[PDB]
Amino acid sequence: YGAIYSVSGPVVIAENMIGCAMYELVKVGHDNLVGEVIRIDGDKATIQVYEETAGLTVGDPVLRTGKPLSVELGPGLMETIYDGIQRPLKAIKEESQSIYIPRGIDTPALDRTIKWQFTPGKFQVGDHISGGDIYGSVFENSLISSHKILLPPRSRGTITWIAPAGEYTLDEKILEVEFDGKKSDFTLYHTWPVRVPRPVTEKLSADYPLLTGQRVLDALFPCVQGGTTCIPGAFGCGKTVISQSLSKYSNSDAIIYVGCGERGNEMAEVLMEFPELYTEMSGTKEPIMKRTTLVANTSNMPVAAREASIYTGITLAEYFRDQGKNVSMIADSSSRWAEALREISGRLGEMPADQGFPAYLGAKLASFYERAGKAVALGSPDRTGSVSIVAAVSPAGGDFSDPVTTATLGITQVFWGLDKKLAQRKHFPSINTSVSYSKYTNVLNKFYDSNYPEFPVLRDRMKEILSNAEELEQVVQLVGKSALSDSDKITLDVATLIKEDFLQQNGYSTYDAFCPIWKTFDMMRAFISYHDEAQKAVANGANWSKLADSTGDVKHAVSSSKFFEPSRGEKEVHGEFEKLLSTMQERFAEST
Amino acid sequence: YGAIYSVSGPVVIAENMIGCAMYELVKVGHDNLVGEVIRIDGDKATIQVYEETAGLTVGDPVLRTGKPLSVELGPGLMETIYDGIQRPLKAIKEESQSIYIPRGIDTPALDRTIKWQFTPGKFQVGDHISGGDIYGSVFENSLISSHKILLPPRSRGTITWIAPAGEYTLDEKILEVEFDGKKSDFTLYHTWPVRVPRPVTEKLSADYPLLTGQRVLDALFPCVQGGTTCIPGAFGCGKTVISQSLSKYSNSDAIIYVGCGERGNEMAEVLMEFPELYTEMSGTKEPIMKRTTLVANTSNMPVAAREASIYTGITLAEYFRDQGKNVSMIADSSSRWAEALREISGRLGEMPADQGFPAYLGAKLASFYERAGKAVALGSPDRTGSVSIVAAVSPAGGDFSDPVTTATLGITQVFWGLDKKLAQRKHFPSINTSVSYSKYTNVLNKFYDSNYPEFPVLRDRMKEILSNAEELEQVVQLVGKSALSDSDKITLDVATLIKEDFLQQNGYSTYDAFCPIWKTFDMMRAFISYHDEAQKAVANGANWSKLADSTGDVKHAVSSSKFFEPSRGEKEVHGEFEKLLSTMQERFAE
Amino acid sequence: NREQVFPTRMTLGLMKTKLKGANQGYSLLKRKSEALTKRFRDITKRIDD
Amino acid sequence: LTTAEYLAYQTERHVLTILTDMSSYADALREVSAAREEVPGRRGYPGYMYTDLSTIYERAGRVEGRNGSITQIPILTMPNDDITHPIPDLTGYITEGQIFVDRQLHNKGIYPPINVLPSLSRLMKSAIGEGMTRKDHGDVSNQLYAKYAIGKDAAAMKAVVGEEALSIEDKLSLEFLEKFEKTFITQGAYEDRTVFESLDQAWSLLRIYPKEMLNRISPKILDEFY
Amino acid sequence: EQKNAGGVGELEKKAEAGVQGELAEIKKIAEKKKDDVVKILIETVIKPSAEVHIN
């Protein structure tokens, strides 16, 4: 037990703490505020407390827990909301009877009263169990069934006794492992330091796509299950809506939605809407909320806790990855994590580096983004999981030259840039098709050739059409459109149609809330066939103005193809699309 | 005998050292690493070590040498390679027998084993000798046929004994000066601090030009023997190529090629290329390395050596000026000297002033550049020397707003600004004609009236043509070149021809490596005559399109004038241009 | 609504030169348009006659 | 690099050192420099970052007596695609050239997207002479550089002023840019163009122009190869 | 092509036997010079130097 020596903002230099470790978790103040040691200058030890510093007196005791900031992995995480340091907000509200979060609440990170059905695994007494091996599973909810119980990493030995099938709480003993003559008792849960990535046997090259549900993201700039993703853009661009839509309609088994610096109203919207929505996975209609946990650390919450929120979320994602699930972390603002880092650095006194962001910001972002990736789990039985980190960067001033944005672009593989010009005029997703890139298009050729062989060719054709139209619009905006060729006019019209109908997706409309991969492929086929038919008809000799006058009906049918509800199914929607191409081909031959 | 109290990198802080003086060389460490005391904070004394501080412990002895940074001026340095201090790289390689530089090696700056032929001067025993006077003439090389053994400045007296003509080494005493009672002894060589300018009787106004060989420089932006020039530009742009062009082909009788903050392969290329080339300055053609000294300090050597190499080169050039030789020192990466200064200031903790550079950057650059200029060396017999300082500056990012670029621009008299746009298009020498200037044209009017009377008028005419064509090209870019005047089109075509065949020369091609003053004057006259003929013929009434169609042959001849080989001599080349003027005049009649 | 130029002193000077040239071209082309408009009005009157 | 030095010199091998993310190395230096509270340079980078980068880079080259060599190709990623950043600036000032990868060319779809204009090789002058390669290497390289610069200027002129205002030379240079970027630079992986084949293709590019327009080509080479 | 490809990857016994001679040579060299190397290591460990720091 030390003492507080200096309190300046979210940092507390506590004296009389010889023996404190780096990033060692402490309890600053009489209310036992959660803090982590940053510097140790002699007996002094600077601490970044993860709570409100108002009211800390010089001389308050500071306890040394002895262990780093440790998330509490285990059953019960899946349908919950956390405060950044893994404090269940429901439990805080129920215990406090107040709409506020009291300073120093020490509620357990996981509900201890709830009894979980336990089904022992293939292991038994005498089997040599290794770190990360599955010695049982628990039924968490209807959607995430068999929440496999993993032996903690770096814990190894022979199984002395295993709990039989039944109902158990988290505090109850579940397993006893003997290592070098010392027995170790294991429960349903286990702690893990958030700073250190959870070990895996061997990471793998991600190849299965992450079906976002947005047309442009799923087609033009695809993302794989197990790859970092960056979403820069100013306020109102659509990063939060893109993230929420990805969490709602992704093919991932679980979601780790992390909000650092995001509004509390976004968290309220997610909590209100996710249970209403349902998924077709697992052979039944179950609420989305049953497979997504939220790490809520809003902007008015303590500054230092944003880093803890990021690390807690990524460690939960790593846990559900080691369970063999396809998880996708969604950090709401890596930029806000970096701004928290800048505030802590400025209060500490380190050198500002660039823009004031600390010099270690790039390394921290690189490590956090390297936590993600498809990997084989650590222990037997063999199972493969993946963590896809899709983090929305928030540049200052709406310019992609911010240090956070530059580091994120350097480290991530997929860059979904957002332009505020399209953020206005209600052109969501406001994806800037010129600067955005995806480096998984090469690896995704296997999946595309397996399922939709014409998908890469159609995507390339649409990309080159968009580039040609960008050049044409650039030249026209200064030199008018009185000298364009018929082919140029066709390109401009078809790309305007693509922007107005295909690329733009109203995520809050029933028809365009979720455009699946097959619908997106069919609509790309429709638009590309329209462009090709127009080009061929005009090259045959037909004037473009007369052709447009005659084929306005076909153009309207193509542009209204987004209204086809995917709820009808793949067979029904594809049946209408096949008739759309056949009618369009006929209406381009009769007109010509 | 002090002791290191702190190291913290290249700047050790030795304690228990009283009586220290600023810029005094101490011997840091057990390996006797040399240094230079740069802050004396009481007993402690911050020292910038010229070698790699790695292993120096707290408690190692530091001893004060009792002398500032001094070079070993004398015979024996006309083909050697020196480090940032003055350490013979060839001798180091031949002694340590290693491809690296041994840490703390102590090799004499001059070879004491070579026996130098000595011939005493007019001074005899009993005469009153003054500092800077000549009392011998050592035959060093074929090019340097008489290395005058100057009496050290600030050392005078009555000659008590002089050695007779014979073969002497660099350690055998040659002269005994009575002085004020204390009979000193003077050998062939003599040391001199590098940060103290060598004395001169009186500096003069440099008149004769330094023929760079490059047409752009030697025609539009001339330099004089004794002038200070700068060649600022981003990486590339041909700063090093221009430097080596003035190193190989120049009117200077000696040269010190300083390479502070330069790649080792640059010095390797100099060492591999210079022995091949020959000049006829002496009676017969002799290799370049017989008149070239390399103060080569690669970029990975300590920043203190980068700081020291500039001063070592400039004081060697001052010595060869004091001998009466027209020297043209070529400093490389003066911006890297400034970067070494900035790093040293940062390690010290002094507050940077402009873009991170130290506040005294301008003062240091002025002190270094002011060492130039034609001057009469003190002492008898009288003889005139010159130190042209052709220093290359490499501003960060290619912007001429850098503090080092601004200070050098304010201090120097000539500025051969280089453009990245012209460099990337391989339009070398890539001289930015709009910004480049020379303040020595007013002085050089006399030499031009003596040798080539029409040169100043032609240079002014070409500058006016280039400026008018730049304005016309801006207007063309603005207004689409709609209905351009015939004279305007003539000026545009002539200036494009000038830029593509007179301001563009491959310094590595055999024909255009060196364009002499006479050849560049003839080419200037040919271009101006072509422009005047076109102007007059169109003013008579001829259409410019038809005139160009008819005179394409003359235009191609003027273009091939750049391909004319200067190796044929003045008589052949001048006659060839006489035909070109005759052909150009013939087209005027048609 | 801004050129994609990396912020630098050289870039700033280049853009100031570009702005001066753009203003000069604007003035020159407006004056040329005025002259050609006078010539076009004269040509229209001559065409009617 | 000390492993490379050992192999190349003490073993007489021909090492091809490939450093990647030298920008990340410089970021590590900045992290260490910031922690030490030393006086910073541009963008917070240490004032001695030039010396550290020079120490790393200058460990490559051939040595007398030894029959081995080190050929460094440090993969430097400019942070904001700006060559004026301290890391690329000091790297280009220390090293013997640079290969410039262009975001604009990558957007155009050219691989390798090597923007030849900012790229430079200071040893090209001595390594591309007669005997080592064909006698036309230097002239062809200079002519291609000049015509590509003219092409970029003509593209800017076409973008700003009307296309009809472009001269015949401007149109030819636009065509040269199109075929240079879309046929000469575009190579694809595993292509393996020999130097002589690349020179022949470059000549095919230069045969668009009449022999009169090719200023950078010397007359002898122009007569021999055109 | 598939049939030829399968045979290439099965070839590992030849590679294993090729190194088998190297292991025998290493074991022979060790068995030969163990006495000398261990004895000189023992001499080095047993015989220290009472050397004070130079500074």
Ligand SMILES: Nc1ncnc2c1ncn2[C@@H]1O[C@H](COP(=O)(O)OP(=O)(O)OP(=O)(O)O)[C@@H](O)[C@H]1O
């Ligand atoms: N895909 C979409 N479909 C329909 N409307 C959208 C879509 N994306 C965004 N919008 C609209 O634009 C608004 C943008 O808000 P959003 O939460 O996406 O902002 P943001 O860029 O994440 O901002 P912040 O940086 O402040 O968190 C939404 O509230 C919604 O009204």
Ligand SMILES: Nc1ncnc2c1ncn2[C@@H]1O[C@H](COP(=O)(O)OP(=O)(O)O)[C@@H](O)[C@H]1O
């Ligand atoms: N006058 C010139 N003639 C021919 N090539 C030149 C000339 N000037 C520069 N170059 C070319 O520029 C390249 C690099 O120029 P250099 O002088 O090394 O740049 P820096 O000044 O940055 O060292 C060289 O490979 C050289 O071929």
Ligand SMILES: [Mg+2]
């Ligand atoms: Mg948001």
Ligand SMILES: [Mg+2]
């Ligand atoms: Mg250089």
